[PDB]
Amino acid sequence: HAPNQALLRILKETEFKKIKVLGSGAFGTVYKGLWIPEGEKVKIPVAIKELTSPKANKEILDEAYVMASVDNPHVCRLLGICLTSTVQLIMQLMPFGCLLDYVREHKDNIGSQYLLNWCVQIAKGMNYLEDRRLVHRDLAARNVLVKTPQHVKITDFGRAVPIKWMALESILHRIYTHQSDVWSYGVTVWELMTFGSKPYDGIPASEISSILEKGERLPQPPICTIDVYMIMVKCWMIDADSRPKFRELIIEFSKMARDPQRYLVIQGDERMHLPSPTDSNFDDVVDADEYL
């Protein structure tokens, strides 16, 4: 058990300025924003999460405790906090949002190259969380954020219940493990391969435990060769050590992403194209990942 040497950064409310609401949900309000620090001549695009009961402040700072301890190119990092009346969290801006709404609203351009890279990247992030002995407990396509369409990161592990993503031993005994995240990674891939479909759609979350104990699982997407679906199926096995480890999910999908059309059959997948750093895409603005 090594000493967590993460630096926690305190920001002034006047160094950054909000710009627009990204989502006034139940938790509170998330804003697109710009952060202009000190006299550094840089503007970092950020997101800002604000919610003053003392029950909440302890939680928003425990979440911030975790998100300050991670550093990986496929996991979202905390940039800092702001100590106003309620605590504000300042994270890197992922301009394209959750992957779940990105695959729904762009399915007509998602070729097999992206789907398999995303599968690699998510696995790389989860394998980092394995090295950091960190169990996500809520991997899903909504908890993946799209910086660029070829760069996604895992978020929302402030809980380190959504039954349909949960492993079997997570529903009957609330046993959560790295090898239970593999199952949620499986449902997450299933989400990507069905371009945003709802798992076990229509079924009440009650019967999901029976369904799985008999031996039923999620369907095989059309675009999915048996090579891919075999992976998703191995994630959903009863015995947990029989499921793949994330460093294997990395290796497998890496093979498949070399010949993407051999494993995902998408009609039109050859001239699809997604927005990517080419002439358009993007005054003194720098990305957070290059500001250290």
∠ CA 257-261-264, rounded to 5°: 85
Catalytic-residue membership of 138 = yes
φ/ψ (deg, to 5) at 144: -120, 130
Q: Rounded to the nearest whole angstrom, what is the least distance from the CB of residue 201 to ligand 8LU in the complex?
A: 17
Q: Rounded to the nearest whole angstrom, what is the least distance from the CB of residue 69 to ligand 8LU in the complex?
A: 14
Q: Which of 261, 281 has the CB closer to ligand 8LU?
A: 281
With contact defined as beta carbons under 8 Å apart, do 111 and 266 qualify?
yes
Cα separation, 206 vs 101, whole angstroms: 26
Name which of residues 33 to 52 contact ligand 8LU (CB under 6 A).
47-49
Name which of residues 185 to 244 contact ligand 8LU (CB under 6 A).
none
Helix (H, G, I), strand (E, B) or coil at 17: strand
Cα separation, 44 vs 42, whole angstroms: 6
Binding string, residues 76-95; x marks residues near ligand 8LU by CB under 6 A: -------------x-x-xxx
Q: Is 100 in the site for ligand 8LU (CB under 6 A)?
A: yes
Q: Which of 136, 137, 142, 153 binds ligand 8LU (CB under 6 A)?
A: 142
Residue with tokens 């957070």: 288
Q: Which of 35, 75, 82, 96 binds ligand 8LU (CB under 6 A)?
A: 96
Cα separation, 56 vs 28, whole angstroms: 11
> Which of 163, 155, 157, 119 has its CA nearest to residue 137?
157
Which of 108, 138, 201, 284 is an active site residue?
138
The two tokens of residue 155 are: 């978020």
Q: Is 254 exposed, middle or buried (0-12, 13-18, 19+ CB in 10 A)?
A: middle
Q: Which of 11, 16, 18, 22 binds ligand 8LU (CB under 6 A)?
A: 22
Q: Is 137 in the site for ligand 8LU (CB under 6 A)?
A: no
Helix (H, G, I), strand (E, B) or coil at 141: helix
Q: Which of 144, 256 has the CB closer to ligand 8LU?
A: 144
Bridge partner residues of 45 (DSSP): 34
Distance set, CA 72 to CA 4, 5, 14, 127, 234 (Å): 16, 15, 28, 10, 26
Cα separation, 21 vs 6, whole angstroms: 29
Q: Rounded to the nearest whole angstrom, what is the least distance from the CB of residue 26 to ligand 8LU in the complex?
A: 13
Q: Rounded to the nearest whole angstrom, what is the least distance from the CB of residue 59 to ligand 8LU in the complex?
A: 12
Q: Rounded to the nearest whole angstrom, what is the least distance from the CB of residue 93 to ligand 8LU in the complex?
A: 5
Q: Which of 117, 155, 180, 184 binds ligand 8LU (CB under 6 A)?
A: 155
Q: Is 165 in the site for ligand 8LU (CB under 6 A)?
A: no
Number of residues that bind ligand 8LU (CB under 6 A): 19
Q: Which amino acid is at 111?
A: G
Q: Which residues are catalytic?
A: 138
Contacts to ligand 8LU by CB under 6 A: 22-23, 30, 47-49, 89, 91, 93-98, 100-101, 142, 145, 155
